Ligand binder design. Structure first.
Ligand code: SF4
Ligand code: SF4
Ligand code: FE
Ligand code: FE
Lengths: 491, 491
C-alpha cells in the first residue's frame, strides 16, 4: 500500500520492527488505531499500489495546498490532503476563491464611488470560510457555491454599472483618437474610472493631455468623463503592449488597477501606481493626490502630434435599445444572420490569435459585441455596418459584461424566444480572476454552448472539465473556420 | 553555454537552436533576436539564466512556489518556479499568506454576522486584500508585509467586535466547572465555534429532556451566563477536535457540527451526524438555517446515553474576573511569589511534534501561571496544577477568537505593574493549525510582541526569506525542547 497523502509505501515485506510489526505482517493485520508515520492519517488513507503517483515533470501535480500545519513534511499537500480533502475538492475551493477575488475587485471599485452591497460581503465571508481547512468537503456544494458566486457577481456588476451611471451618466458612442497630440502627457492604465476622474479634475487648466490605455478606453463614452477637453484620446492598446507603449511615448504613466507589469528602465522613473496597484521601485500615489504625476508630465519632454486613427467605443444599453426595431426588421428579413459575443480578458498567448482570425472570417451578415481588453484583437478592423447597424459594438470594460447580459434579455423579449433559442453565439476570452467570476456568472444564467479561450483554466482537473462540458456544454475554442461553421448551421 | 528559463525550465541548447521559431541549429544565445521568447511559456530572453548549477534533486513537495490562477500559467497547469506574469516565489507566498489571514478574518466575520454584528471597514479591507492578490496588481513584497500587518490589525478589530457580540448576546463569561462525562438520556454533541447555533439548539431543546454536550471548541460556552442558564447543557464530552473519530463512535449520540474542524465520518456515526452553518460533509444531512428538529428527532430515536464517572474542567475567565484580582497579582509579583506568566495555547493538530506542549506545561515551575485558549488547551487542561495564593495556575480564556482578551490582558498587566509591554514577566508560546491562527499571529505581530514561540511547525508557505523576516525583525522563535525553552524564557 502507498499512502494517498504522502506516498509512503507500507510494504508487508519489511514491516516495522520498532513498533511491534515483525517483518511479514500483512497490511490488514495492523492495529485499528494505527496512523501514518509521516502524515498521521489512519489505515483508510492507504491505497493498494497505484503507481508513480507524484514524480511530476512536464505537469501533473495532483493538487496543491499548504495552508495548515498538518501538511505533509511542512511543505505542501500534493496528492491528497492530510485533512482528508481530495484533489478535485481543493481545485474547486481554489475556483471559488478566484471567483470571489473577481467579485472583490468589482466591489472595491464600486465602494470607491460610495456604492456598497451587504449581502455580497456576507457571501464573501461565507465562501472564504467554506474554503478553510476542515469545514467543507462536499464537491457538489462547491458547484452550488460557484453558481451562487456567479449570481453574486451578477449583482456586483449591476451595482458597479449603477455606480458608474450615477457618477458619470450612461455611456454613449464615441470616436476616440488613438494617437498623440502636442504637449505633456499622462497615460492612464487599468479599470478605475474614479482615479481617472480625479486626475482629469486635477488637470483642468494644467494643459497636460491625458490619454487612456487598455481598459480605460470605455471612459470616452461616459458623459461625465468625455466632457474634459484635456482627455485627448486613446494611446496604446491592450495591457500587454504596455512595455513598448510606455517606452515610445515620452509621458508620465499611471496605473490605476490590475494589469500593470514590472517596468523597464526607460520609463521606471516616470511611472506611478495608485489604488491597489503597486510595483517595486515605482512611486505610489497617496490616495488621489496626483501632484507627482502632473509634476513629472510637466518635467518631461512633451509629446509630438502624430497622424492619428480612431476607435469606436461606449455602446450603453440605451443606444443599443434605440436600434431594436431595425435589428428586428433586419433579422426577420435575413440581412443579419447571427449575433456573436466575442471578447473578455486577453493574454499575449499565441492561441489568442484565434480571436483575430475568428472575427476576420466571420460572415458579413453578422454583428460582434466585444468587451474588456480582448477587444484590441479586432476593434481597429473596418467592419462597417449592416443597413445602419454597426457590425462591431463595444460595451466597455470586463465589468460591462452585465450590460451584455441585459442585452440578451432584451433580445429574448425582442424576438419572443427563450434565451437559449436566440441567433446568438458566445465566445469568451479569459485571463484572470475577474474573468472567472464572469464565467461563473454566465454559467449561473444557464448559458449553454459557450466557447472559451485561450486555454482551459489551470485549476480544472478532468473531473471539473467534464462536469462543465457535459452539464453546461462549455466548448473549448478549436479552429476559427470550423467553429463558425458549427455555430451557424441549422441545416 | 546552455540557458535555462527561470519560469518553465525550458533549456535553450545552442547545438539545436530553435527550429520552431526560425533559429537555425548552431546559434549562440546572445546572437538571438531581442524579441525571441521561450517556445513553451512565451517569456522573453530577459528571464533566461545560463544553465549554471544543472544539479536537480528531490522535486516532490520541494516546489519553489505554486500558482495557476491565470491563463498565462506555464503549460496551462501551474507556475512552479517563477510566474509567466513576472511574480516571484516570495511574492506568491506572501500573497497566499495574506489570503490565509483574511480567511481567518472572514471566519470570525461570519460568526459575528450570525449575531447581527458587522463592520464595514473590515469588509472594505477584505476586498482590498483580495484585489491586492489578483494577477497583475501588486509585485511589491514589502507592501505585502505591510498588508499582513494591516490584516493583523483588522483581525484584532474583528475579534473585538465578535467579543462585543458574544457579550451582548450572552453576557460576560465567568469561571465554570464543567463535567466531562456523559449523563443518562438522549444526547446531542455539538462541535465547532458557533455559539449562536448552540443557543438556538438549547432554546429548541428546552423541555425535550435531551442533554446537550459541548465538544472541542464549544466548551467556553459554559462560562457565558446566557448559555449556562439552560439546564440541559449537561457538560463537556470528548476533548479536542481530532479525537472526533473515536468520540462520536463511543457515545450513542446525535452529532452536530457548527463550524470548522469536522472530519470525514466513519460509518458508525454517519447516519447520526448533521452539519449547519458553513460546515458541510458529503453524505451528511445539513441543517437549513438552524431549526434543529431533525437532530432532536434523531437524538430521541437513538438508545439513550449512560452515566459515567466524570472528570471536571474549569473554563471561562472573562476580563472582569481577572481584573478583580489585579492587586493580588501585584502583591504576588512584587513580593516575588509569582515570577513569570506564560501564554501557552492556540489551535492544535494531531501532529506528534505537538506532544511538546504537554511536556512544556508538565515541566513548568510552580511559581508560574499559564493562560490557554483554543484547542491547544486540551493538551494540559486536565492536569491538576492547583494554585499559588488563590490565583489558579491554569486560566482558560475561551475560544481561539478569545485571543483578543489575552491581548487586553497583557495591556492590563503593563498598566498593572507600570512596565513597558516588552519588559513584562510574560512569555508567549503559540500553537497554530489553520488560517484563523495565521490571522491571530499577524495580530500579535502588529502588536510588536517579540520573542514569541510557535509550534508545531513553521508555516508551509514561509520560504527562507519570509522566515528570515519573521526571525530577524520580530524574533519569532520556533519551539525546541521544553526544558531548554523554559530555561531561556525564564531568564
Ligand atoms: S487543509 Fe488539508 S490539504 Fe490543505 S494543507 Fe491542511 S491538510 Fe493539507
Ligand atoms: S498570475 Fe503569474 S504565477 Fe499566477 S498563474 Fe498567472 S502567470 Fe502563473
Ligand atoms: Fe503518508
Ligand atoms: Fe519558458
Amino acid at each position: 500500500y502507498r499512502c494517498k497523502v504522502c506516498d509512503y509505501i507500507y510494504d508487508p515485506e519489511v514491516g516495522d520492527p520498532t513498533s511491534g510489526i515483525k517483518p511479514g505482517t500483512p497490511f490488514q493485520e495492523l492495529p485499528e488505531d494505527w496512523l501514518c508515520p509521516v502524515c498521521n492519517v489512519g489505515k483508510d488513507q492507504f491505497e493498494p499500489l497505484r503507481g508513480e503517483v507524484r514524480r511530476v515533470r512536464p505537469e501533473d501535480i495532483d493538487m496543491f495546498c499548504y495552508q495548515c500545519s498538518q501538511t505533509v513534511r511542512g511543505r505542501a499537500c500534493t496528492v491528497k490532503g492530510v485533512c482528508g480533502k481530495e484533489a478535485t475538492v481543493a481545485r474547486l475551493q481554489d475556483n471559488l476563491l478566484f471567483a470571489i477575488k473577481g467579485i472583490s475587485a468589482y466591489l472595491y471599485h464600486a465602494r470607491e464611488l460610495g456604492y456598497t452591497d451587504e449581502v455580497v460581503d456576507a457571501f464573501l465571508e461565507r465562501g472564504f470560510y467554506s474554503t478553510l481547512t476542515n469545514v467543507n468537503f462536499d464537491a457538489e456544494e462547491f458547484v452550488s457555491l460557484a453558481l451562487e458566486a456567479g449570481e453574486m457577481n451578477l449583482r456586483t456588476m449591476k451595482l458597479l454599472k449603477k455606480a458608474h451611471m450615477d457618477t458619470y451618466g450612461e455611456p454613449e458612442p464615441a470616436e476616440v483618437r488613438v494617437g498623440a497630440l502636442d504637449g505633456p502627457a499622462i497615460i492612464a492604465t487599468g479599470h478605475s474610472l474614479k482615479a481617472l476622474e480625479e486626475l482629469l479634475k486635477q488637470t483642468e487648466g494644467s494643459g497636460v493631455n491625458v490619454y487612456t490605455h487598455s481598459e480605460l478606453l470605455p471612459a470616452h463614452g461616459y458623459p461625465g468623463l468625455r466632457k474634459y477637453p484635456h482627455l485627448a484620446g486613446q494611446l496604446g492598446g491592450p495591457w500587454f503592449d504596455q512595455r513598448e507603449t510606455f517606452s515610445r511615448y515620452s509621458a508620465a504613466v499611471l496605473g490605476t488597477s490590475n494589469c500593470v507589469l514590472l517596468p523597464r528602465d526607460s520609463y521606471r522613473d516616470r511611472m506611478f501606481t495608485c489604488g491597489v496597484a503597486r510595483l517595486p521601485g515605482v512611486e505610489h500615489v497617496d490616495g488621489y493626490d496626483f501632484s507627482p504625476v502632473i509634476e513629472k508630465a510637466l518635467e518631461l519632454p512633451p509629446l509630438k502630434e502624430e497622424d492619428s486613427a480612431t476607435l469606436t467605443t461606449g455602446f450603453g444599453l440605451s443606444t443599443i435599445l434605440s436600434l431594436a426595431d431595425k435589428i428586428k426588421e433586419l433579422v426577420e428579413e435575413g440581412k443579419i444572420r447571427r449575433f456573436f459575443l466575442v471578447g473578455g480578458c486577453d493574454s499575449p498567448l499565441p492561441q489568442a490569435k484565434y480571436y483575430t482570425e475568428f472575427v476576420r472570417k466571420l460572415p458579413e451578415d453578422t454583428v460582434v459585441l466585444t468587451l474588456a481588453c480582448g477587444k484590441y484583437r479586432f476593434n481597429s478592423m473596418d467592419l462597417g455596418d449592416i443597413d445602419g447597424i454597426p457590425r462591431l459594438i463595444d460595451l466597455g470594460q470586463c465589468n460591462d459584461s452585465i450590460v451584455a447580459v441585459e442585452l440578451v434579455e432584451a433580445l429574448s423579449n425582442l424576438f419572443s424566444m427563450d434565451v437559449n433559442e436566440l441567433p446568438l453565439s458566445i465566445v469568451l476570452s479569459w485571463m484572470e480572476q475577474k474573468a472567472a467570476a464572469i464565467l461563473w456568472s454566465l454559467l449561473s444564467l444557464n448559458l449553454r454552448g459557450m466557447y472559451i479561450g485561450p486555454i482551459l483554466p489551470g485549476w480544472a482537473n478532468d473531473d471539473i472539465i467534464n462536469v462543465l462540458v457535459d452539464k453546461y456544454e462549455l466548448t473549448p475554442i478549436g479552429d476559427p473556420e470550423e467553429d463558425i461553421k458549427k455555430m451557424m448551421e441549422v441545416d
